[PDB]
Design a binder for this molecule. Sequence first.
Ligand SMILES: Nc1ncnc2c1ncn2[C@@H]1O[C@H](COP(=O)(O)OP(=O)(O)NP(=O)(O)O)[C@@H](O)[C@H]1O
Ligand SMILES: Nc1ncnc2c1ncn2[C@@H]1O[C@H](COP(=O)(O)OP(=O)(O)NP(=O)(O)O)[C@@H](O)[C@H]1O
Ligand SMILES: CCS(=O)(=O)Nc1ccc(CC(=O)N2CCN(c3ccc(Cl)nn3)CC2)cc1F
Ligand SMILES: CCS(=O)(=O)Nc1ccc(CC(=O)N2CCN(c3ccc(Cl)nn3)CC2)cc1F
Ligand SMILES: [Cl-]
Ligand SMILES: [Cl-]
Ligand SMILES: [Mg+2]
Ligand SMILES: [Mg+2]
Lengths: 352, 352
Amino acid sequence: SPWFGMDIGGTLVKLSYFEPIDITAEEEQEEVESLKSIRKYLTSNVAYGSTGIRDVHLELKDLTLFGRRGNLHFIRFPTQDLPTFIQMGRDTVLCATGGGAYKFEKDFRTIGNLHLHKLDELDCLVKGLLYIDSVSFNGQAECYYFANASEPERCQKMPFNLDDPYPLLVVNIGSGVSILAVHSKDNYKRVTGTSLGGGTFLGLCSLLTGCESFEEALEMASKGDSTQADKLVRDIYGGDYERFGLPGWAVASSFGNMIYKEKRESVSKEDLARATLVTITNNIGSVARMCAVNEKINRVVFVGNFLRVNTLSMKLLAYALDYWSKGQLKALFLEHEGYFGAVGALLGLPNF
Amino acid sequence: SPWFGMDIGGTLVKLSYFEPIDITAEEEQEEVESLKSIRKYLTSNVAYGSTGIRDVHLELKDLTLFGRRGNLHFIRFPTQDLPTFIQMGRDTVLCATGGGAYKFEKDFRTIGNLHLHKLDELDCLVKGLLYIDSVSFNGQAECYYFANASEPERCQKMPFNLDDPYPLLVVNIGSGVSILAVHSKDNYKRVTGTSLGGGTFLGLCSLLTGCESFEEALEMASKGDSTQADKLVRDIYGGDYERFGLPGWAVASSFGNMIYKEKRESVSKEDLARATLVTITNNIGSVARMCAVNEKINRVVFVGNFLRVNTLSMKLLAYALDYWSKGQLKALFLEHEGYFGAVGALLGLPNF
Ligand SMILES: Nc1ncnc2c1ncn2[C@@H]1O[C@H](COP(=O)(O)OP(=O)(O)NP(=O)(O)O)[C@@H](O)[C@H]1O
Ligand SMILES: Nc1ncnc2c1ncn2[C@@H]1O[C@H](COP(=O)(O)OP(=O)(O)NP(=O)(O)O)[C@@H](O)[C@H]1O
Ligand SMILES: CCS(=O)(=O)Nc1ccc(CC(=O)N2CCN(c3ccc(Cl)nn3)CC2)cc1F
Ligand SMILES: CCS(=O)(=O)Nc1ccc(CC(=O)N2CCN(c3ccc(Cl)nn3)CC2)cc1F
Ligand SMILES: [Cl-]
Ligand SMILES: [Cl-]
Ligand SMILES: [Mg+2]
Ligand SMILES: [Mg+2]
């Protein structure tokens, strides 16, 4: 039986797979042809079907897991295509997490004698996060931040040490947002969440701009000017609102300039894409800061696939957190930001 | 000189006017014809020009202000039409607040010998709020709440006593949102704010539905089904997420179902209007609860014109606050919710 870990979310399925590379000549003969055909299929291809992708750059190599040396692979595909995934498998213990582990439980059991063990999506998130940072990213730091995030000529990616990670505020930006307070490896809680997450960005951008992919929405946003749609403090006061420390460039009302018909007719789709990104990202950063001040935690780490290949939101979260906290809070990011639930599920295999 | 109080916001201008009704026969002769023509113009009409409206139902009668008995009137018009207002006035001390008091200061001074005194929009908000509740709404309570807000067959408007209003969390929903912690009549602070306010609802709804007025957007929203656009917890888990107390009906991702092309093509404009309202209202309620728990305040009052003739957002704020706080927080509302800044400005007249 292959060693899998699966996080079936509302939007994407994340899969962690451990490829053994210490296979002996005796183990290779005892390897069932269906087991060997799966390993060759997953290691010989980087695209699976029309929608499966292996993030090769994130692969952890020569990892010692469960007493075996092997490579840890990271694979993703849309939850919409899970029926295809299950149908291929109908032609083994699966530790599955996320909402889809419960919603599609009966569908997984159509696979003969498959044992499905459901694990909680936030248990696996914490366990997977702490594990990846503990084994490092092939010798490099798993955690990083943007140094001098307020100065763009100095803003640069720098490693960050999490050798004692407690306390920690984890902001999981998926379809929605979950915010966790991690006080210990066995003591964490979900402080709150918001429904304004990555699905809101992709959903609104599809309605406003007709974009057909997450990557295309980011590409439109990078070319836009969000101030064409948002109403700023300087649009209301003529400048800064100095009494309450609000700079003139601060957004007073997201999409607030779209109450005027003349501005709706001159705004571009790139502007609306950028305004959607800024609106979602700013709100997430503000909620994270409020929870951090309440939980008395100064280290806030952002995970989830909304930040995948999304440097604009990361730098915006970095600048916003630092500016509005007066330097008291730090925005942290992880190289395997979308796969920690799938890793945590895989780590539950010995417990079964 | 007539007694005015003006709050020039990012979207609407709010005007409070004190009509003396204890005018003596001697004072009537000494009344300049321009002063008398203004009083007759404002008291004989409920619509001013094409965009001015007098909220007659909110008028306070037989109010003793500055040693005089009179009626307190409440008038509003779009900030976009302030040039018309100023031009009419060019054919008197004005206490003005809001962002427009600074942005349009030079425009007000085109009126001959007019003395403009700028006051802060949150000082006037606190002073105006405490004053109106202290003099009552013509004998009725200015403050009210929705009793049994979790049971729709029992949800009903009920008066609420604010005879000692401290501490108090004020949520000002205008173009954006400001959240204030009122510890005393001379001790209050702005804890935070969010750019997802009434301008976001009106701006997004105009882009998504082509609505041409705030009232038309509310009318579309009352006919829609927000679950056609939002992705729910039950869409991700197949039911409740019982481990973290998330019911199946809770919104997991606002507009999250709009990532699918087939659902974007079947959604109606009323559904998108309703989803925009629910999205803005839920986020405001969640931020209010987070600030209330942090500030250790259990009374949260919502003001601003986003809730004007908007019973859907009020009841949603009432149910959401009560449900997510497990009964610890109370959503409060005020009959003069949009005019407290204009009243507070008027009350600064003796200080000049
Ligand atoms: N290829 C992609 N397809 C769709 N969304 C993507 C893609 N790449 C990045 N994203 C973004 O990442 C978000 C989904 O992130 P993810 O962490 O996988 O959440 P999820 O687990 O699927 N949803 P949830 O059930 O709430 O956990 C999407 O809403 C997008 O904003
Ligand atoms: N007739 C209307 N026209 C426009 N908006 C309205 C109207 N009636 C209610 N509203 C809502 O009320 C909001 C404006 O409320 P308001 O409290 O007057 O804010 P503001 O002071 O003008 N903006 P701000 O500068 O941030 O204070 C609008 O964004 C709408 O959502
Ligand atoms: C968790 C994994 S998931 O798959 O189910 N996704 C998912 C689901 C829900 C949410 C939102 C959430 O947590 N909410 C609780 C707090 N809330 C409010 C609202 C009003 C008020 Cl006054 N107070 N609180 C908003 C809703 C985010 C998610 F990312
Ligand atoms: C005040 C009267 S106004 O006319 O100027 N209107 C007005 C103006 C601005 C705002 C928004 C606001 O207060 N913000 C400060 C807090 N913030 C963040 C963002 C990211 C992070 Cl990480 N942390 N905090 C978001 C912006 C609301 C308004 F209603
Ligand atoms: Cl199980
Ligand atoms: Cl002045
Ligand atoms: Mg997830
Ligand atoms: Mg205002």
